[PDB]
Amino acid sequence: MKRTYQPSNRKRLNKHGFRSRMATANGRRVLAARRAKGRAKLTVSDEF
């Protein structure tokens, strides 16, 4: 059967990528929380 995750690299970066996070105040708020935690992976732009 068709499952929930059907990958598309173009969709992934448009929805969760680094440049989309930086485009809004609430996205930059997410980046600040992940930096303060010390995450090695900041966005999906890192795993690529």
Partner RNA sequence: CUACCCUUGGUCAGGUUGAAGCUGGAGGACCGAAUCGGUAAGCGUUGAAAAGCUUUCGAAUGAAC
Partner RNA sequence: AAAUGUAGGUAUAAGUAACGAUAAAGGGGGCGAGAACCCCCCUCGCCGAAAGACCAAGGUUUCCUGAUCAACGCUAAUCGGAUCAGGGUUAGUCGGGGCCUAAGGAUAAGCCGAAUGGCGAUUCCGAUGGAAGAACCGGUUAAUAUUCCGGUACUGAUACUGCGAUGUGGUGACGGAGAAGUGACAGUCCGGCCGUCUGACGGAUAGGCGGUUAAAGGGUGUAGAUGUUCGGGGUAGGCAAUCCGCCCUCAGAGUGCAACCUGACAGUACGGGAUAAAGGACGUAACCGGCUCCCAAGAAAACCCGCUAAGUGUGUUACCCGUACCGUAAACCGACACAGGUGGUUGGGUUGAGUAUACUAAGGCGCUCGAGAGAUUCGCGGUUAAGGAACUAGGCAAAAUGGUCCUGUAACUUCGGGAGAAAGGACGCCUGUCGACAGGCCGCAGAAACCAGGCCCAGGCGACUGUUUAACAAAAACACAAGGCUAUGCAAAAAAGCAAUUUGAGGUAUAUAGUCUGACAC
Partner RNA sequence: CCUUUACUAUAGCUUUACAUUGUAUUGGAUACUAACUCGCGGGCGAGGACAGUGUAUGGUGGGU
Q: Which residue lies nearer to RNA by CB, 5 or 36? A: 5
- Number of helices and strands in the chain (H, E): 4, 0
- Residues 12-31, one symbol each (x = binds RNA by CB under 7 A, - = not), give -----------x-x------
Binding of RNA at residue 41 (CB under 7 A)?
Answer: no
Q: What is the CB neighbour count within 10 angstroms for residue 37?
A: 7
Q: Which of 2, 36, 37, 40 binds RNA (CB under 7 A)?
A: 2
Q: What are the b/e assignments for 12-26, b being 16+ CB within 10 Å? A: ebeeebeeebeeeee
Q: Where on the chain is the footprint of RNA (CB under 7 A)?
A: 1-10, 23, 25
